[PDB]
Amino acid sequence: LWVTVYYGVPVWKDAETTLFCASDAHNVWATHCCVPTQEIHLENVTEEFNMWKNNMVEQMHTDIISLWDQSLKPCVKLTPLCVTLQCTNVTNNITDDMRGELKNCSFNMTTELRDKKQKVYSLFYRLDVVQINKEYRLINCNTSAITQACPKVSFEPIPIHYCAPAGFAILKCKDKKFNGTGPCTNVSTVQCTHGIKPVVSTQLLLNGSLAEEEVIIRSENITNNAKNILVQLNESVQINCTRPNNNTRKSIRIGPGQWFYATGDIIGDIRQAHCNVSKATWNETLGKVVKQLRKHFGNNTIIRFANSSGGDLEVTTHSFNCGGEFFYCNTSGLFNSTWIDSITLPCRIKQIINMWQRIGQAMYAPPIQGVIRCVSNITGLILTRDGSTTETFRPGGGDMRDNWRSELYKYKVVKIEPLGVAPTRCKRR
Amino acid sequence: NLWVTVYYGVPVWKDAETTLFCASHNVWATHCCVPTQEIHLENVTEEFNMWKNNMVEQMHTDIISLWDQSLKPCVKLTPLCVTLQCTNVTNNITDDMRGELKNCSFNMTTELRDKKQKVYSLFYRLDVVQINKEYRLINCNTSAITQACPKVSFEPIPIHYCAPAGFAILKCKDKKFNGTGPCTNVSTVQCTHGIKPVVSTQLLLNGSLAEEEVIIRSENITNNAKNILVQLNESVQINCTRPNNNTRKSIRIGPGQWFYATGDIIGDIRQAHCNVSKATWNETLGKVVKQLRKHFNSSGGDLEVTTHSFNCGGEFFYCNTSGLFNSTWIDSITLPCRIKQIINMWQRIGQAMYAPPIQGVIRCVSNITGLILTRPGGGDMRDNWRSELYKYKVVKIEPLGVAPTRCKRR
Amino acid sequence: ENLWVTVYYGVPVWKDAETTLFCASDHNVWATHCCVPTQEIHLENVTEEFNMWKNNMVEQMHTDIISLWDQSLKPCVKLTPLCVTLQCTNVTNNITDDMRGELKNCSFNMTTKKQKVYSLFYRLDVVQIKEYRLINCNTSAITQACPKVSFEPIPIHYCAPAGFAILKCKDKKFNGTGPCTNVSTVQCTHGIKPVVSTQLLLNGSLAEEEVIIRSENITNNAKNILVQLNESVQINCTRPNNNTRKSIRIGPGQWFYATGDIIGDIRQAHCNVSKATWNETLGKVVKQLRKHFGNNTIIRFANSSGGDLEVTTHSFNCGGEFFYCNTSGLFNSTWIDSITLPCRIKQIINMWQRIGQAMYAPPIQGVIRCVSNITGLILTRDGNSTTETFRPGGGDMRDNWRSELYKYKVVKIEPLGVAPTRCKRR
Amino acid sequence: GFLGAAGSTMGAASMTLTVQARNLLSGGIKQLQARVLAVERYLRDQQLLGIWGCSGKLICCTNVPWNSTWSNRNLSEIWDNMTWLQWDKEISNYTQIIYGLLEESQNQQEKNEQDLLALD
Amino acid sequence: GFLGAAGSTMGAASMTLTVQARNLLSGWGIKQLQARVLAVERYLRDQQLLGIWGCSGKLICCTNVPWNSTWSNRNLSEIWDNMTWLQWDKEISNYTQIIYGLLEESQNQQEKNEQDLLALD
Amino acid sequence: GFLGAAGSTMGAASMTLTVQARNLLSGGIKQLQARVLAVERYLRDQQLLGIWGCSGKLICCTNVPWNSTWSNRNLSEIWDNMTWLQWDKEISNYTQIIYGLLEESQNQQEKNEQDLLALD
Numbered sequence A: 001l002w003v004t005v006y007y008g009v010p011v012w013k014d015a016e017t018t019l020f021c022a023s024d025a026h027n028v029w030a031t032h033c034c035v036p037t038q039e040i041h042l043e044n045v046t047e048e049f050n051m052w053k054n055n056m057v058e059q060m061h062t063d064i065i066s067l068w069d070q071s072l073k074p075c076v077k078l079t080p081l082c083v084t085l086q087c088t089n090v091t092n093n094i095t096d097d098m099r100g101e102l103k104n105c106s107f108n109m110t111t112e113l114r115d116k117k118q119k120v121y122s123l124f125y126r127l128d129v130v131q132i133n134k135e136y137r138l139i140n141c142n143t144s145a146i147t148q149a150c151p152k153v154s155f156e157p158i159p160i161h162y163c164a165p166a167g168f169a170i171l172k173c174k175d176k177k178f179n180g181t182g183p184c185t186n187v188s189t190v191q192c193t194h195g196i197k198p199v200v201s202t203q204l205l206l207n208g209s210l211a212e213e214e215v216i217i218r219s220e221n222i223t224n225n226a227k228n229i230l231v232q233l234n235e236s237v238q239i240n241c242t243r244p245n246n247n248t249r250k251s252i253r254i255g256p257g258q259w260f261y262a263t264g265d266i267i268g269d270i271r272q273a274h275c276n277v278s279k280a281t282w283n284e285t286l287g288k289v290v291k292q293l294r295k296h297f298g299n300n301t302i303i304r305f306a307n308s309s310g311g312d313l314e315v316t317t318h319s320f321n322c323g324g325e326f327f328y329c330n331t332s333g334l335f336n337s338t339w340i341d342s343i344t345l346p347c348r349i350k351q352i353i354n355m356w357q358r359i360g361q362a363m364y365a366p367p368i369q370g371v372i373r374c375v376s377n378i379t380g381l382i383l384t385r386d387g388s389t390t391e392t393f394r395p396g397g398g399d400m401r402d403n404w405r406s407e408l409y410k411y412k413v414v415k416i417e418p419l420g421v422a423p424t425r426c427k428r429r
Numbered sequence B: 001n002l003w004v005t006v007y008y009g010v011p012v013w014k015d016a017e018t019t020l021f022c023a024s025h026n027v028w029a030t031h032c033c034v035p036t037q038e039i040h041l042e043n044v045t046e047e048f049n050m051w052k053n054n055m056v057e058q059m060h061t062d063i064i065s066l067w068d069q070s071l072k073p074c075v076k077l078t079p080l081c082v083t084l085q086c087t088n089v090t091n092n093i094t095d096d097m098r099g100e101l102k103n104c105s106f107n108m109t110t111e112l113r114d115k116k117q118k119v120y121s122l123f124y125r126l127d128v129v130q131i132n133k134e135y136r137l138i139n140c141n142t143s144a145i146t147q148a149c150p151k152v153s154f155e156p157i158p159i160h161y162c163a164p165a166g167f168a169i170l171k172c173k174d175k176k177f178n179g180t181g182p183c184t185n186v187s188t189v190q191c192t193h194g195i196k197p198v199v200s201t202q203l204l205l206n207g208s209l210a211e212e213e214v215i216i217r218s219e220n221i222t223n224n225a226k227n228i229l230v231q232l233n234e235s236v237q238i239n240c241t242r243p244n245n246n247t248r249k250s251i252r253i254g255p256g257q258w259f260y261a262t263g264d265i266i267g268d269i270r271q272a273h274c275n276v277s278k279a280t281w282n283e284t285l286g287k288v289v290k291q292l293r294k295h296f297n298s299s300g301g302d303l304e305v306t307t308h309s310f311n312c313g314g315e316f317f318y319c320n321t322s323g324l325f326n327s328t329w330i331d332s333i334t335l336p337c338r339i340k341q342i343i344n345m346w347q348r349i350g351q352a353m354y355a356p357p358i359q360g361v362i363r364c365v366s367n368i369t370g371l372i373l374t375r376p377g378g379g380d381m382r383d384n385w386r387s388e389l390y391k392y393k394v395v396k397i398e399p400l401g402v403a404p405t406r407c408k409r410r
Numbered sequence C: 001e002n003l004w005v006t007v008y009y010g011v012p013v014w015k016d017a018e019t020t021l022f023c024a025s026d027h028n029v030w031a032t033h034c035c036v037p038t039q040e041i042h043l044e045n046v047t048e049e050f051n052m053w054k055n056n057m058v059e060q061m062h063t064d065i066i067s068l069w070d071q072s073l074k075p076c077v078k079l080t081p082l083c084v085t086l087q088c089t090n091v092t093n094n095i096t097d098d099m100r101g102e103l104k105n106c107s108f109n110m111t112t113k114k115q116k117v118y119s120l121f122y123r124l125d126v127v128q129i130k131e132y133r134l135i136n137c138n139t140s141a142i143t144q145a146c147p148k149v150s151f152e153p154i155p156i157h158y159c160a161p162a163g164f165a166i167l168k169c170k171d172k173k174f175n176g177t178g179p180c181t182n183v184s185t186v187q188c189t190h191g192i193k194p195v196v197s198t199q200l201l202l203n204g205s206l207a208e209e210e211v212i213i214r215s216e217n218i219t220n221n222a223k224n225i226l227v228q229l230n231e232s233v234q235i236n237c238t239r240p241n242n243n244t245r246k247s248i249r250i251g252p253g254q255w256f257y258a259t260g261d262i263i264g265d266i267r268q269a270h271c272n273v274s275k276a277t278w279n280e281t282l283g284k285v286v287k288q289l290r291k292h293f294g295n296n297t298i299i300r301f302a303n304s305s306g307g308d309l310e311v312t313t314h315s316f317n318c319g320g321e322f323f324y325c326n327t328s329g330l331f332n333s334t335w336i337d338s339i340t341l342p343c344r345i346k347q348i349i350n351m352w353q354r355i356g357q358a359m360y361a362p363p364i365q366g367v368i369r370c371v372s373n374i375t376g377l378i379l380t381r382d383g384n385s386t387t388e389t390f391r392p393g394g395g396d397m398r399d400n401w402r403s404e405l406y407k408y409k410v411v412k413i414e415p416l417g418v419a420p421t422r423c424k425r426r
Numbered sequence D, F: 001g002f003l004g005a006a007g008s009t010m011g012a013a014s015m016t017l018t019v020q021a022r023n024l025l026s027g028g029i030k031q032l033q034a035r036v037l038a039v040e041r042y043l044r045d046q047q048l049l050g051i052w053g054c055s056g057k058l059i060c061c062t063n064v065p066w067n068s069t070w071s072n073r074n075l076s077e078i079w080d081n082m083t084w085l086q087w088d089k090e091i092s093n094y095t096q097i098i099y100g101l102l103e104e105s106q107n108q109q110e111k112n113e114q115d116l117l118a119l120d
Numbered sequence E: 001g002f003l004g005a006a007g008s009t010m011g012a013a014s015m016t017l018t019v020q021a022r023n024l025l026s027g028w029g030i031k032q033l034q035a036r037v038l039a040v041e042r043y044l045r046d047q048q049l050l051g052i053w054g055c056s057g058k059l060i061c062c063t064n065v066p067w068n069s070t071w072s073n074r075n076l077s078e079i080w081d082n083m084t085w086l087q088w089d090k091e092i093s094n095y096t097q098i099i100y101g102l103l104e105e106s107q108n109q110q111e112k113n114e115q116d117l118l119a120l121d
């Protein structure tokens, strides 16, 4: 027998590379994912997948942080804004739940000429100020610069697709009950991932993919209480969120081409922001989650759901960003049951945002005029388990990689190496 | 009995839009680092369209980009956005300059954060706006003013655009080519020849002349939304000056940060102006009219469009052309000029440049090689570059092809 | 008669070339830059011509060093709040009189509400305009170097890109120019520590057989002479004072590191060179200089001339601190147990003769001691009859790299060529 | 010169293939992008010739017959009385069909070579 | 149908090699240039190996280097009919450099022998 | 063993062409420029061998006769005497002449093959 050389051989190795972003043709993602956007079944291929070690997740995480920072990098800083504020209560046609939530603050700030100053006022939410010595300063003035987000820039998530560079391919696992790690016996090759919306939230994962047959419970180690449980639902739960106050925007010149966008006066009555979850739907949804948890924790085990505990209102609440506004909603009205017409969740609003658990940076979110309505789909949950016949589950969050693992779990990147040899009966002459 | 035969190196092409590169303390001399052949194509007829030409769009983009990179590493004049105390310039000043110049005193920073200084400088009226005798610089409203670095030369030099491998630039050599349609005298070139990036309005300066006749070109003749670019058959020589013998003072405003201020005029004070010969100008218009008949004062907007924007000696002039275009067809002409130091180029609003003063007296002589008419108009800029790039197009070379032959493999 | 052109590819030939080399190595500035990890072929019958004075590798290294330095200082605190008037008095608190007048206790108004703060400064960094200001507040911004960044030299290697090779001269007597008959091909250089110094070259390679004196056009007085020693001279340098640091907040998350109080008594920084070792070392240099200047020519060593502190003294970076030592105790003899060199310390540093940039070197806590190897000298000739006077000197950093990159040449591989053969018809 | 034969007939222009091929590989970030792209174009044309069994040739003959429906023109109306610029329009919609046929023919031929070298 | 044959045995997957070849070139700032430059470098390295072994221009190349039972002590009937290329690649993964070195040595000797015969036998 | 044969005569050095060839392609903006240049130089040499009809070969014989003016030497004074570095210097002024002749010869050879295949 003789060595025969073959080129174009259908083989591969696991690999880590840089994927590029493509989209479906002033949004950040639309601007970045400039490349515009089939599937090949691989019969008898049984490849091994590992969600918890998937490099595509780290790439997505890095791309989000980088774009966010590049987006804010050229925007006006609010350094000249942190002066002592003189604040009083907003008491005009305000309900009871809102008393003390809003303050009317006046202060001495700069103008376009170096020798001039102006007295201006703005409204602030209680969560954005620090009382001193009534006199206030903004949160984070003495620890970081606060950058105002540009009002023209949209952070609305749009679907994005990750695509392999030439020489690489993405393998997709089609096993309907795949639990993140292990062998997959139904594999296909794709050029790009499905459209993934880079939605940022805690506790409840919004606008993702649904499971096709049953609720799927995924964990790196289901028996390790230090790890999170990602729960993918097989139907969505619709959640209706709003910020009912008709607001205004007050543009203040702070320098030569530099503007600050202050919260202006509120038109009409002042009410608390909130989210509505259908009650029957939520109850049935948890019953399904519980059946699947029993498969790991015992069919005679008591399963309890309880709310969050420690941490700031970044993780103890359901954080989300819709309509350009940042909401921190109370989910204790959802995670309150023991297993053997609507639920209203009150919400808090903040303008000074510390993204991705960093402490040296902050963003100021300009006010949004009018009234905000958002309708979202709950597609999954993040649960944690308490550390002998009863188990207790609580909402989790904070580490964004776990949100992106809920979509990038079916995909693996491999490198194609189309060259090899094998014995044959031919001889070159 | 025909077989497919495959050929590589086939001399064919397609229209394409690709990136061209430039070849030659001047900004273009520094940028166009590449040093600098024409092949006649017999029996090749090609279609050209100057109004749909990516080469023009790239030249526009490159000029803006280069300008910004040039100003980026320079002194940012934000210490000057203070209230200025200003009076009129008097003493040996003519009647035509009354109220034209102002003497402004102000409180400026120094190299130490705990010290201040009182300085004064002259400004032209166009740069200073009231806000009493209290004034501010016109742009201490919308943006920062960057001082151009005095060592940097923005003198236009000829530059050449060159194609990357796999591409070619085709040149139209037809006489009396009006910027569109088929061209029968065609050749391939490596580069576009020396095009000077001269920035002006109404009158196009130091461009190419037509070989035989004045050529009238427009995207859509008989529309009204389009400019008419007139390429002249002969040049008209225009003599411009800023007669005032000036000086400078260097003011330190920070740790090695210098501001260049206009000093006292050390000679008499007179108005800037441009001259053209009267007969040459009258003959030039007669030729333009003769051609306009084969087909059948400026107004509206700011100085940048209503006047002849002109860069002479590095100084920025805004000349009145009503002395050139005031006649109905059916020894010299003098055009008064204004001088401005705060320049907002290319209709951008987030940027501004301070043009440092120039010592002594400025004189230059330029060639009028074309007009932009609509009645003078223009101010679009892309249209100035279209007057030099109208004869070029970029094509992509496509080396593979197949054809029937009687040759069978083996 | 019957010869035909035959084309060969993979022919072992080359041409002189200038290309870009990349760095490779085994919070340090070079450690994070030379991220590429790190092979010699003797050429049996190759004679090649080398010229260390026109070697492009030297210019490439110079450019890379400047770039890394400037890049590492970009994401750091810009000390503009310090360009204010200072009111300074002399420190007399337990000074041993060698240091009298060297340290000043400066009080100033920090405008970042204003606050009154204190710091100590070395005499060399303060301009007496009481009423003092820091040097360079009239010329350039001063950037504080980031305390976490280490500028300690580590060996680095320059490596050829594909298509290129580096040829190395292995002769033992190589004089810096001309043909070399022991040539080998290498992928990367031997490992060069980017040590910055003047007058004395520290921690370089030693000559293997004898002291080698290399210079371009040696009869020309306006040229530096690079003397490579065959044995090192150990030099012990210290900054005996026990310093502390004072952190002054100057913004929302930004701090200035000021020199704090000295604990214990205050003494002058100094370097120790053994007398016997220095005398034998210097004698060897003289023995070799006479080969160019004459067997009965008197050689005299004299100290440096006037000029900037940076070139009249022996400058070096020790522990991260910047020393400017007086070498007149070394270069002082006529040729026919230890030497103590007094040292000055400076915190505002202007490198590579640039004046538009300045760096503030944060104070270093504790006591500093370095043990360094003198591996070579940089001498110049003083403009005569029978006496040749030599002085230490030269501030051009390129010469500190020519001393290591003298054995290497970069060549471009040209694999294609033709020759006559007797074959035809492909 | 480059494209000197562009207006010549196909049978004349076929004699300047070396001239055209010779200048295709060789005539701030955008300059680097321009060079990378020129290399990619060059390689795609070379890969394609290799797939068709024409590696190393400017003129190569294959086993794919000419299907008359692609042109409906006879000899001396193609190699004469016509230029390549026009031919490139006459068959512009059959290019992908022809390329697919060329790839298939070569794959079949390599298998046949492999068998003959084993059988004999 | 890229990698469509993966999972099929070698005797079937060895056919339709054009598909995995014609799809190797047909694919931020610096990061995208790096992705493109790498794809070119990888392509060229594989082509360089085929060239130096005398397999330029071929997808299927017979050579004159004998197969060793040491590399794989198996019959053709249990390789081409029973194994997939992914399995085969693992089976002989430790003999790849040995085989490649032998292929280069063979080609060098062959070119010299051809030159000697072109020069009048 | 890259350049190991550099000091050897041409007759021996011609046997090490594979070690030289396999080391030519492999082994912030400046790193990309270095990589792009390595690729462009590699491809220019490969294109040139291909245009001369030598693609895939390290040693190729052509039909361009050797001119006694390019080098007035016997084979025994070259192959068993000179190193390649010396040879390269001796005939460097004829480089373009030889290259031009090599391109013309290959173009004629391809046309002759095409005519023979059509004739047979």
Ligand SMILES: *[C@@H]1O[C@H](CO)[C@@H](O[C@@H]2O[C@H](CO)[C@@H](O[C@@H]3O[C@H](CO[C@H]4O[C@H](CO)[C@@H](O)[C@H](O)[C@@H]4O)[C@@H](O)[C@H](O[C@H]4O[C@H](CO)[C@@H](O)[C@H](O)[C@@H]4O)[C@@H]3O)[C@H](O)[C@H]2NC(C)=O)[C@H](O)[C@H]1NC(C)=O
Pocket (backbone or CB within 6 Å): B155, B156, B198, B205, B206, B311, B312, B313, B314, B363, B364, B365, B366, B367
């Ligand atoms: C259309 O094209 C014409 C040219 O055909 C352009 O006009 C020329 O513009 C340039 C730049 O503005 C002028 O150059 C300047 O000339 C000044 C005076 O020159 C005299 O002195 C020099 C001394 O060496 C002699 O060689 C020369 O013959 C003259 O006797 C110089 O003083 C200027 O120098 C500047 O730079 C140096 C740099 O070191 C500084 O030291 C100086 O202080 C100063 O800042 C400069 O060289 C040229 O003279 C103009 N030609 C004519 C005929 O006037 C038109 O501008 C162009 N049209 C448009 C719209 O751009």
Ligand SMILES: *[C@@H]1O[C@H](CO)[C@@H](O[C@@H]2O[C@H](CO)[C@@H](O[C@@H]3O[C@H](CO[C@H]4O[C@H](CO)[C@@H](O)[C@H](O)[C@@H]4O)[C@@H](O)[C@H](O[C@H]4O[C@H](CO)[C@@H](O)[C@H](O)[C@@H]4O)[C@@H]3O)[C@H](O)[C@H]2NC(C)=O)[C@H](O)[C@H]1NC(C)=O
Pocket (backbone or CB within 6 Å): C150, C152, C153, C195, C202, C203, C316, C317, C318, C319, C320, C369, C370, C371, C372, C373
């Ligand atoms: C020529 O080459 C010589 C070396 O051959 C250089 O001399 C060395 O220079 C470095 C830096 O100046 C010295 O490093 C410092 O050593 C101090 C002493 O520690 C000793 O004892 C501990 C006991 O546990 C050992 O672990 C340690 O290895 C030593 O043996 C340390 O206290 C210093 O630590 C501080 O700096 C480091 C910097 O990374 C920080 O991480 C630490 O947290 C801390 O802040 C430091 O490690 C080294 O000791 C010198 N060697 C000798 C023999 O003196 C010359 O400087 C060089 N010449 C020139 C001009 O560059």
Ligand SMILES: *[C@@H]1O[C@H](CO)[C@@H](O[C@@H]2O[C@H](CO)[C@@H](O[C@@H]3O[C@H](CO)[C@@H](O)[C@H](O)[C@@H]3O)[C@H](O)[C@H]2NC(C)=O)[C@H](O)[C@H]1NC(C)=O
Pocket (backbone or CB within 6 Å): A156, A157, A199, A206, A207, A320, A321, A322, A323, A324, A373, A374, A375, A376, A377
């Ligand atoms: C989950 O997906 C839903 C859509 O399925 C997202 O809700 C949509 O959000 C956009 C942007 O806030 C709304 O559009 C806006 O409408 C106003 C109308 O005046 C217009 O002025 C704005 O310019 C913009 O076009 C859209 O109406 C809304 N959809 C619904 C049903 O209300 C939702 O935000 C996503 N969830 C999360 C957390 O991202």
Ligand SMILES: *[C@@H]1O[C@H](CO)[C@@H](O[C@@H]2O[C@H](CO)[C@@H](O)[C@H](O)[C@H]2NC(C)=O)[C@H](O)[C@H]1NC(C)=O
Pocket (backbone or CB within 6 Å): A084, A130, A131, A132, A133, A137, A138, A139, A140, A141, A142, C113
């Ligand atoms: C940032 O620092 C300033 C001091 O520099 C803080 O302001 C002081 O707060 C104390 C206690 O409330 C008062 O007694 C002082 O009179 C305040 N100083 C001034 C100048 O007003 C300020 O509170 C800090 N920022 C935040 C968010 O707390």
Ligand SMILES: *[C@@H]1O[C@H](CO)[C@@H](O)[C@H](O)[C@H]1NC(C)=O
Pocket (backbone or CB within 6 Å): A089, A091, A099, A100
């Ligand atoms: C202002 O808010 C505080 C919040 O604790 C509340 O106690 C107080 O009564 C409010 N004042 C008015 C006038 O409503």
Ligand SMILES: *[C@@H]1O[C@H](CO)[C@@H](O)[C@H](O)[C@H]1NC(C)=O
Pocket (backbone or CB within 6 Å): A084, A086, A106, A107, A108, A119
């Ligand atoms: C602005 O400054 C003046 C200074 O006298 C002070 O009286 C006033 O209260 C300040 N205003 C605000 C809103 O802080």
Ligand SMILES: *[C@@H]1O[C@H](CO)[C@@H](O)[C@H](O)[C@H]1NC(C)=O
Pocket (backbone or CB within 6 Å): B087, B088, B098, B099
């Ligand atoms: C002084 O300036 C004012 C405002 O521009 C103008 O009205 C007045 O006529 C000027 N006086 C003189 C003497 O020019």
Ligand SMILES: *[C@@H]1O[C@H](CO)[C@@H](O)[C@H](O)[C@H]1NC(C)=O
Pocket (backbone or CB within 6 Å): B083, B084, B085, B105, B106, B107, B118
């Ligand atoms: C500078 O400031 C002082 C403050 O009293 C003022 O009197 C003076 O008029 C100012 N000078 C100028 C030129 O603005």
Ligand SMILES: *[C@@H]1O[C@H](CO)[C@@H](O)[C@H](O)[C@H]1NC(C)=O
Pocket (backbone or CB within 6 Å): B239, B240, B241, B273, B274, B275, B332, B334
């Ligand atoms: C324009 O003409 C006048 C005479 O009417 C003359 O005094 C002046 O100097 C001329 N200007 C220029 C730029 O030559």
Ligand SMILES: *[C@@H]1O[C@H](CO)[C@@H](O)[C@H](O)[C@H]1NC(C)=O
Pocket (backbone or CB within 6 Å): B245, B246, B266, B267, B268, B360
């Ligand atoms: C013209 O300017 C120069 C500048 O150096 C000066 O020396 C000369 O005296 C001035 N002449 C005048 C005002 O007539």
Ligand SMILES: *[C@@H]1O[C@H](CO)[C@@H](O)[C@H](O)[C@H]1NC(C)=O
Pocket (backbone or CB within 6 Å): B237, B238, B239, B275, B276, B277, B332, B365
């Ligand atoms: C412009 O200057 C030249 C210098 O030779 C002169 O001949 C010409 O007449 C001047 N033109 C005008 C309009 O004054």
Ligand SMILES: *[C@@H]1O[C@H](CO)[C@@H](O)[C@H](O)[C@H]1NC(C)=O
Pocket (backbone or CB within 6 Å): C170, C171, C172, C181, C182
């Ligand atoms: C250097 O050359 C000498 C002859 O001048 C020879 O004896 C010695 O062995 C050579 N050394 C090396 C490293 O090749």
Ligand SMILES: *[C@@H]1O[C@H](CO)[C@@H](O)[C@H](O)[C@H]1NC(C)=O
Pocket (backbone or CB within 6 Å): C175, C176, C177, C178, C215, C216, C217, C218
């Ligand atoms: C040593 O270097 C100098 C450099 O100027 C040169 O002139 C001299 O000839 C060299 N000596 C030898 C032996 O090559």
Ligand SMILES: *[C@@H]1O[C@H](CO)[C@@H](O)[C@H](O)[C@H]1NC(C)=O
Pocket (backbone or CB within 6 Å): C217, C218, C219, C220, C221
């Ligand atoms: C060497 O120096 C002498 C002066 O001492 C000078 O005349 C000669 O030209 C120089 N040689 C070279 C090669 O530079």
Ligand SMILES: *[C@@H]1O[C@H](CO)[C@@H](O)[C@H](O)[C@H]1NC(C)=O
Pocket (backbone or CB within 6 Å): C234, C235, C236, C272, C273, C274, C338, C371
């Ligand atoms: C320098 O220090 C070493 C020990 O680190 C010692 O052996 C040597 O003698 C000292 N040299 C001098 C000149 O004091």
Ligand SMILES: *[C@@H]1O[C@H](CO)[C@@H](O)[C@H](O)[C@H]1NC(C)=O
Pocket (backbone or CB within 6 Å): B042, B043, D004, D005, D007, D008, D009, D012
């Ligand atoms: C152009 O056409 C003429 C016939 O009209 C022909 O003789 C000439 O050779 C053609 N030119 C080229 C380059 O083929």
